[PDB]
Amino acid sequence: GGGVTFCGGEPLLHPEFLIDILKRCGQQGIHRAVDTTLLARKETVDEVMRNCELLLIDLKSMDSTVHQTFCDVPNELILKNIRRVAEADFPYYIRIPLIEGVNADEKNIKLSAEFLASLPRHPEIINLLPYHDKMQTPSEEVQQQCIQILTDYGLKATIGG
Amino acid sequence: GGGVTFCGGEPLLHPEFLIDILKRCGQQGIHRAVDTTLLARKETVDEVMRNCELLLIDLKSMDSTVHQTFCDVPNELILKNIRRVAEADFPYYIRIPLIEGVNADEKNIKLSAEFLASLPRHPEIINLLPYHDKMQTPSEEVQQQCIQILTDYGLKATIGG
């Protein structure tokens, strides 16, 4: 059936507007997914959850320095938000844009798995999105190794959206 | 920055509502993308284009029988809509969920390329989305062969979203 998705940072800079549109979509029976990666305020995350079906959060790196370099923001808030959604027992997806040279190392993926596995509710799915365009596309071998790691920690993972 | 995306068939069953939400998002400066794959009426496609930044259309198969089997609809309208957007000189993306056993054959991809290449405006990008879950994930070799075909016809293509 599809639905509506809000992605990225910009929608979150219009939080009252976002909630209004989400409410309108709910009335029309349209499925709603919202990227809350960069949402600063916990009351807003709570209100978004009251007005959608699914949260989407990017987990680009467990290394805050890598995260700051590529996202212009540290990861402390991202991790807090993932924990908050998990503790709310609310459905969420985790997306990991997978970039050889940035975040496809065994260490990062294991730290990611350990964080997620420890949460009281796991993600519905973890989407590994191989980079296509150092920053290189991870090999098929690396991609599958990442899937295996996540699977080994009891998490559900796939390549692609 | 991200933005809002409407995907799938359901939003298109509420066309007046869709246009209203698109208008509201435009006022707030939010980028808008709309999946118009299944839009029946040309006046609605035109109105959607007046109220968004980008169209998204799925091209699952050039074989209408394959399309009917997997989508419960023939592809005649899908092809008409792609032509209409192209003739309107409006930005669009084409998505091809790429499934070994359904649509990753050289014939289908070549027919797809020939159709798209012939249009007065090409897609901004063609996203090949390999199936993960006969219906099998296409091999790395097949994926790259599909990219090469599209590239050979002068089209811009990539693996993943």
Side-chain angles (χ1 to χ4, degrees):
Chain A
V4 63
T5 303
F6 288 89
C7 296
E10 186 65 27
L12 304 183
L13 299 177
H14 306 69
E16 187 72 18
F17 178 71
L18 175 60
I19 295 300
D20 187 61
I21 297 306
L22 288 173
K23 285 175 171 175
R24 290 169 185 277
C25 290
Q27 292 170 346
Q28 289 280 350
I30 294 177
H31 180 281
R32 301 156 298 179
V34 182
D35 179 356
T36 60
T37 305
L38 301 174
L39 251 190
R41 289 173 59 257
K42 59 195 166 55
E43 94 159 35
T44 310
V45 176
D46 290 350
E47 187 64 21
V48 168
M49 287 189 288
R50 285 193 275 276
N51 296 286
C52 74
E53 278 69 41
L54 179 66
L55 295 198
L56 311 171
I57 302 168
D58 289 354
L59 186 57
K60 270 183 256 164
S61 185
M62 294 302 294
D63 186 329
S64 198
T65 300
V66 172
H67 198 101
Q68 173 66 40
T69 291
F70 290 77
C71 312
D72 282 310
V73 63
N75 69 2
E76 280 79 350
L77 176 61
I78 283 66
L79 298 180
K80 182 171 287 89
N81 284 349
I82 297 167
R83 186 168 290 283
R84 200 178 178 83
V85 181
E87 288 176 352
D89 194 27
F90 190 89
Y92 66 106
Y93 289 8
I94 294 289
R95 299 97 77 79
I96 303 176
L98 193 62
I99 310 155
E100 179 61 51
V102 178
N103 66 3
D105 53 294
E106 174 181 306
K107 179 178 170 187
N108 184 61
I109 301 301
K110 288 181 174 178
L111 289 174
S112 297
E114 290 172 7
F115 168 70
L116 295 172
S118 74
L119 300 172
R121 181 178 178 122
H122 293 167
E124 297 301 285
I125 192 64
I126 301 166
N127 301 289
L128 304 184
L129 312 170
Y131 173 82
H132 287 275
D133 251 336
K134 76 185 172 184
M135 292 192 71
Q136 309 177 337
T137 305
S139 63
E140 187 170 7
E141 189 183 326
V142 168
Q143 290 176 41
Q144 295 301 328
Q145 286 166 345
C146 293
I147 294 293
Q148 190 62 58
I149 290 160
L150 293 163
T151 304
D152 287 345
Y153 280 94
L155 299 159
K156 301 176 180 167
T158 194
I159 300 296
Chain B
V4 63
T5 303
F6 288 89
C7 296
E10 186 65 27
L12 304 183
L13 299 177
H14 306 69
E16 187 72 18
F17 178 71
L18 175 60
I19 295 300
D20 187 61
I21 297 306
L22 288 173
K23 285 175 171 175
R24 290 169 185 277
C25 290
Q27 292 170 346
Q28 289 280 350
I30 294 177
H31 180 281
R32 301 156 298 179
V34 182
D35 179 356
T36 60
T37 305
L38 301 174
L39 251 190
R41 289 173 59 257
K42 59 195 166 55
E43 94 159 35
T44 310
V45 176
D46 290 350
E47 187 64 21
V48 168
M49 287 189 288
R50 285 193 275 276
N51 296 286
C52 74
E53 278 69 41
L54 179 66
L55 295 198
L56 311 171
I57 302 168
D58 289 354
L59 186 57
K60 270 183 256 164
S61 185
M62 294 302 294
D63 186 329
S64 198
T65 300
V66 172
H67 198 101
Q68 173 66 40
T69 291
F70 290 77
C71 312
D72 282 310
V73 63
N75 69 2
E76 280 79 350
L77 176 61
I78 283 66
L79 298 180
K80 182 171 287 89
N81 284 349
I82 297 167
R83 186 168 290 283
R84 200 178 178 83
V85 181
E87 288 176 352
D89 194 27
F90 190 89
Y92 66 106
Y93 289 8
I94 294 289
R95 299 97 77 79
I96 303 176
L98 193 62
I99 310 155
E100 179 61 51
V102 178
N103 66 3
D105 53 294
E106 174 181 306
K107 179 178 170 187
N108 184 61
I109 301 301
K110 288 181 174 178
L111 289 174
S112 297
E114 290 172 7
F115 168 70
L116 295 172
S118 74
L119 300 172
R121 181 178 178 122
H122 293 167
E124 297 301 285
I125 192 64
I126 301 166
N127 301 289
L128 304 184
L129 312 170
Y131 173 82
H132 287 275
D133 251 336
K134 76 185 172 184
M135 292 192 71
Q136 309 177 337
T137 305
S139 63
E140 187 170 7
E141 189 183 326
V142 168
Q143 290 176 41
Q144 295 301 328
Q145 286 166 345
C146 293
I147 294 293
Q148 190 62 58
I149 290 160
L150 293 163
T151 304
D152 287 345
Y153 280 94
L155 299 159
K156 301 176 180 167
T158 194
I159 300 296

